[PDB]
Design an enzyme around this catalytic site. Structure first.
Site, PDB file in Angstrom:
ATOM      1  N   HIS A 166       0.966  -1.241  -0.002  1.00  0.00           N
ATOM      2  CA  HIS A 166       0.191   0.044  -0.049  1.00  0.00           C
ATOM      3  C   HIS A 166       0.954   1.284   0.183  1.00  0.00           C
ATOM      4  CE1 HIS A 166      -3.220   2.856   1.052  1.00  0.00           C
ATOM      5  NE2 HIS A 166      -2.776   2.820   2.442  1.00  0.00           N
TER       6      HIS A 166
ATOM      7  N   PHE B 187     -10.094  -4.228  13.914  1.00  0.00           N
ATOM      8  CA  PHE B 187     -10.464  -2.910  14.110  1.00  0.00           C
ATOM      9  C   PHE B 187     -10.510  -2.079  12.787  1.00  0.00           C
ATOM     10  CE2 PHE B 187     -10.034   0.512  17.453  1.00  0.00           C
ATOM     11  CZ  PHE B 187     -11.372   0.756  17.809  1.00  0.00           C
TER      12      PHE B 187
ATOM     13  N   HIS C 253      -7.218   5.511  10.046  1.00  0.00           N
ATOM     14  CA  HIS C 253      -6.751   6.123   9.044  1.00  0.00           C
ATOM     15  C   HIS C 253      -7.779   5.819   7.655  1.00  0.00           C
ATOM     16  CE1 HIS C 253      -4.270   6.436   5.083  1.00  0.00           C
ATOM     17  NE2 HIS C 253      -4.364   4.979   5.117  1.00  0.00           N
TER      18      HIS C 253
ATOM     19  N   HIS D 287      -8.358   5.228   3.765  1.00  0.00           N
ATOM     20  CA  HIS D 287      -7.654   5.152   2.419  1.00  0.00           C
ATOM     21  C   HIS D 287      -8.513   5.908   1.324  1.00  0.00           C
ATOM     22  CE1 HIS D 287      -5.394   0.876   2.783  1.00  0.00           C
ATOM     23  NE2 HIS D 287      -5.712   1.643   4.065  1.00  0.00           N
TER      24      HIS D 287
ATOM     25  N   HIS E  19       0.609  -4.545   3.464  1.00  0.00           N
ATOM     26  CA  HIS E  19      -0.645  -4.326   3.767  1.00  0.00           C
ATOM     27  C   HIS E  19      -1.252  -5.829   3.617  1.00  0.00           C
ATOM     28  CE1 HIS E  19      -4.243  -2.452   5.074  1.00  0.00           C
ATOM     29  NE2 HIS E  19      -3.913  -1.197   4.962  1.00  0.00           N
TER      30      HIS E  19
ATOM     31  N   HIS F 255      -4.044  -4.101  15.967  1.00  0.00           N
ATOM     32  CA  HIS F 255      -5.380  -3.899  15.989  1.00  0.00           C
ATOM     33  C   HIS F 255      -6.325  -4.132  14.905  1.00  0.00           C
ATOM     34  CE1 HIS F 255      -4.759  -0.928  19.858  1.00  0.00           C
ATOM     35  NE2 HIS F 255      -4.093  -1.975  20.008  1.00  0.00           N
TER      36      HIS F 255
ATOM     37  N   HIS G 141       0.818   4.769   1.148  1.00  0.00           N
ATOM     38  CA  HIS G 141      -0.194   5.392   2.141  1.00  0.00           C
ATOM     39  C   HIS G 141      -0.175   6.693   1.862  1.00  0.00           C
ATOM     40  CE1 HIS G 141      -1.269   5.854   6.226  1.00  0.00           C
ATOM     41  NE2 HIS G 141      -1.205   7.096   5.942  1.00  0.00           N
TER      42      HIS G 141
ATOM     43  N   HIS H 274       4.116   0.243   2.670  1.00  0.00           N
ATOM     44  CA  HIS H 274       4.251  -0.655   3.496  1.00  0.00           C
ATOM     45  C   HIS H 274       3.500  -1.895   3.060  1.00  0.00           C
ATOM     46  CE1 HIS H 274       0.248   0.461   5.355  1.00  0.00           C
ATOM     47  NE2 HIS H 274       0.725   1.479   5.464  1.00  0.00           N
TER      48      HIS H 274
ATOM     49  N   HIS I  34      -9.529   1.958   9.281  1.00  0.00           N
ATOM     50  CA  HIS I  34      -9.132   1.244  10.284  1.00  0.00           C
ATOM     51  C   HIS I  34      -8.084   1.953  11.185  1.00  0.00           C
ATOM     52  CE1 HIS I  34      -5.035   0.501   8.417  1.00  0.00           C
ATOM     53  NE2 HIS I  34      -5.803   0.442   7.293  1.00  0.00           N
ATOM     54  N   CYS I  35      -7.850   1.368  12.438  1.00  0.00           N
ATOM     55  CA  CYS I  35      -6.846   1.907  13.233  1.00  0.00           C
ATOM     56  C   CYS I  35      -5.523   1.537  12.479  1.00  0.00           C
ATOM     57  CB  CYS I  35      -6.932   1.144  14.616  1.00  0.00           C
ATOM     58  SG  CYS I  35      -5.657   1.748  15.840  1.00  0.00           S
ATOM     59  N   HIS I  36      -4.845   2.253  12.572  1.00  0.00           N
ATOM     60  CA  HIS I  36      -3.497   2.106  12.119  1.00  0.00           C
ATOM     61  C   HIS I  36      -2.323   1.430  13.078  1.00  0.00           C
ATOM     62  CE1 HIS I  36      -0.068   1.917   8.893  1.00  0.00           C
ATOM     63  NE2 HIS I  36      -0.987   2.669   7.971  1.00  0.00           N
ATOM     64  N   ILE I  37      -2.546   1.103  14.307  1.00  0.00           N
ATOM     65  CA  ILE I  37      -1.874  -0.070  14.977  1.00  0.00           C
ATOM     66  C   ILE I  37      -2.211  -1.363  14.516  1.00  0.00           C
ATOM     67  CG2 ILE I  37      -1.679  -0.858  17.321  1.00  0.00           C
ATOM     68  CD1 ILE I  37      -2.574   1.925  18.290  1.00  0.00           C
TER      69      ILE I  37
ATOM     70  N   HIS J 230      -5.921   5.511  19.499  1.00  0.00           N
ATOM     71  CA  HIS J 230      -6.084   4.818  18.392  1.00  0.00           C
ATOM     72  C   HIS J 230      -6.128   5.796  17.284  1.00  0.00           C
ATOM     73  CE1 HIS J 230      -7.509   1.086  20.256  1.00  0.00           C
ATOM     74  NE2 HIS J 230      -8.184   1.922  20.798  1.00  0.00           N
TER      75      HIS J 230
HETATM   76 CU   LIG Z   1      -6.006   1.042  17.679  1.00  0.00          CU
HETATM   77 CU   LIG Z   2      -0.687   3.160   6.028  1.00  0.00          CU
HETATM   78 CU   LIG Z   3      -3.443   4.046   3.882  1.00  0.00          CU
HETATM   79 CU   LIG Z   4      -4.922   0.519   5.485  1.00  0.00          CU
END
Ligand SMILES: [Cu+2]
Ligand SMILES: [Cu+2]
Ligand SMILES: [Cu+2]
Ligand SMILES: [Cu+2]
Ligand SMILES: *[C@@H]1O[C@H](CO)[C@@H](O[C@@H]2O[C@H](CO)[C@@H](O)[C@H](O)[C@H]2NC(C)=O)[C@H](O)[C@H]1NC(C)=O
Ligand SMILES: *[C@@H]1O[C@H](CO)[C@@H](O[C@@H]2O[C@H](CO)[C@@H](O)[C@H](O)[C@H]2NC(C)=O)[C@H](O)[C@H]1NC(C)=O
Ligand code: NA
Length: 499
Positions: A65, A463, A400, A402, A112, A458, A67, A110, A452-455, A397
């Site tokens: 992905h 999440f 993010h 897309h 994905h 998670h 980002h 990164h 989604h949460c980017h941790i 949290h």
């Molecule tokens: Cu999170």
């Molecule tokens: Cu990302």
């Molecule tokens: Cu993204």
């Molecule tokens: Cu994503």
């Protein structure tokens, strides 16, 4: 050297020791972080990703992905596994061929697939602006002015319990740092500046989890960009940066020639700086080659506060100036229990058929789409508001979206919305108990966009939800290349999956 906008990128396994401890990894371009991919605004990027992975303990499939890049008309190139593509299998390659109209700033790339980016597949992605409105504010902006902040784990990602509080073993700044336990005096990164020059430092969080309190002893930092969005100048002495966020700041090399600590304190794992953990070195040309002797203050007098940021351009806010003042006002119920996260009562588990392929095969409402209850349709050409009230365990949290950036109408730790001039960005901390962080955007980009949460731990524990934006126009807006159409048959054959 930077690579791109047209380049091959090989994904391999190798041993690395960024904190003195050797472990195998998943690497782009043979390094951690991966090489910087770069080009100019509006360029055609064609990143031909060669999957050369053989170690099953970090997964031999991959997907990448880009980002923060909107992917308008190229949803198929976005990268999230089982949302926009099936993974690339080992010994195969895939050309991510897209354009970056109307964007210029600091991004990253990164893996994905699952938690694979934690195992090492992460690097910077910079889209320069030849007519940058901020150009006159600095002298130097190049590969040497990119600063990455990373969490690093001695345990391989596929051995991290799902839904657990997973803690890192080192902070890495530009790929180097020292381990929190069994600390050895392994090499620290050095950022070199020339007295009197001004630098555009591009600060990228490539974190899988922690947020960092980032500062440079003796220096302050003038923010000019937030997640790709040019800002008014904001001078601070500390930046709290959450996973996947980016800032550009001007560093004025206006202190005495010498050595200064660069600090990145994570919210979990090792606290402080004993033994040179959580640290890198700012070295002025002409300084002695030795560690800094500088001190942090006890408290920082001018920390970044998100509501102080404002766009350089007159971006405004879409919709009307009150809660619910949008064509499609949403409130997500964000929860955690028993090791799994949920959104609106449903924990995300990736489907067998990628969401985009389900839509191209004729599924045309969100209740026809899998996973059931994990896909929300958005209407076209409409103002969307999404309230993200915090409270779920494991915070804060960083959410993010897309395909989009968004106005941050309400920020963490402040109950007052801003319908006039908030910053726009792509990843936002939703704060703490009782907060009501809220985002707005307009739907001008048909396709399925992950939220989604980017941790990353998670996301793996569920999440997430998918915004199926303008389902009726997805197929006409996003013509797909044969190589993309080939990915799911190849993947499913290799894994003995029937579909
Ligand atoms: Cu999170
Ligand atoms: Cu990302
Ligand atoms: Cu993204
Ligand atoms: Cu994503
Ligand atoms: C966050 O803001 C949203 C609105 O953006 C609030 O949503 C309202 O919630 C109440 C019930 O709690 C409903 O009666 C309304 O229909 C919702 N939409 C509105 C008023 O526009 C939400 O309650 C807020 N959450 C927190 C924790 O403050
Ligand atoms: C809490 O957030 C609000 C909204 O973003 C901030 O209020 C703005 O404060 C600025 C700077 O003084 C004023 O110019 C704006 O008119 C305010 N807008 C609104 C809608 O009130 C506020 O400063 C933030 N609080 C803290 C402590 O930073
Ligand atoms: Na407006």
């Amino acid at each position: 050297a930077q690579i791109g906008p047209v380049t091959d990128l090989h994904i391999t396994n190798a041993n690395i020791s960024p904190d003195g401890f050797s472990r195998p990894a998943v690497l782009a371009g043979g390094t951690f972080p991966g090489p910087t991919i770069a080009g100019n605004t509006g360029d055609n990027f064609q990143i031909t990703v060669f999957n050369d992975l053989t170690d099953p303990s970090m997964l031999t499939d991959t997907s990448i992905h880009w980002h923060g890049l909107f992917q308008k008309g190229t949803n198929w190139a976005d990268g999230p596994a089982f949302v926009t593509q099936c993974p690339i299998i080992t010994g195969q390659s895939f050309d991510y061929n897209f354009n970056v109209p109307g964007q210029a700033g600091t991004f990253w790339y990164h893996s994905h697939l699952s938690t694979q980016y934690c195992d090492g597949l992460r690097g910077p992605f910079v889209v320069y602006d030849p007519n940058d409105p901020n150009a006159s504010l600095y002298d130097v902006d190049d590969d040497t002015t990119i600063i990455t902040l990373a969490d690093w784990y001695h345990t391989l990602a596929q051995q991290e319990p799902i839904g657990a509080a997973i803690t890192a073993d080192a902070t890495l700044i530009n790929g180097l740092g020292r381990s929190f336990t069994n600390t050895t005096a392994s090499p620290l990164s050095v950022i070199t500046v020339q007295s009197g020059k001004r630098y555009r430092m591009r600060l990228v969080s490539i974190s899988c989890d922690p947020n960092y309190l980032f500062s440079i002893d003796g220096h302050d930092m003038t923010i000019i960009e937030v997640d790709g969005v040019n800002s008014q100048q904001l001078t601070v002495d500390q930046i709290q940066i959450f996973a996947a966020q980016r800032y550009s700041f001007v560093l004025n090399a206006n202190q005495p020639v010498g050595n200064y600590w660069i600090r990145a304190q994570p919210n979990s794992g090792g606290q402080g700086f004993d033994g040179g953990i959580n640290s890198a070195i700012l070295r002025y040309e002409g300084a002695t080659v030795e560690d800094p002797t500088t001190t942090a203050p006890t408290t920082f007098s001018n920390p970044l506060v998100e509501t102080d940021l404002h766009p350089l351009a007159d971006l405004g806010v879409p919709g009307q100036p009150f809660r619910g003042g949008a064509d499609d006002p949403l409130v997500l119920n964000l929860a955690f229990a028993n090791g799994r996260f949920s959104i609106d009562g449903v924990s995300f588990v990736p489907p067998t058929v990628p969401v985009l392929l389900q839509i191209l095969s004729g599924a045309q409402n969100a209740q026809d789409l899998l996973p059931a209850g994990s896909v929300i349709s958005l209407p076209s050409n409409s103002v969307i508001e999404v309230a993200l009230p915090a409270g779920a365990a494991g915070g804060p949290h960083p959410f993010h979206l897309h395909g989009h950036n968004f106005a941050v109408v309400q920020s963490a730790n402040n109950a007052t919305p801003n319908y006039v001039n908030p910053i726009w960005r792509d990843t936002v901390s939703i704060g703490g108990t009782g907060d009501n962080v809220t985002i707005r955007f307009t739907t001008n980009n048909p396709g399925p966009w992950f939220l989604h949460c980017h941790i990353d731990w998670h996301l793996e524990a569920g999440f997430a939800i998918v915004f199926a934006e303008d389902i009726p126009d997805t197929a006409s807006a996003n013509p797909v290349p044969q190589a993309w159409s080939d990915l799911c048959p190849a993947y499913d054959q290799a894994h003995n999956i029937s579909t």
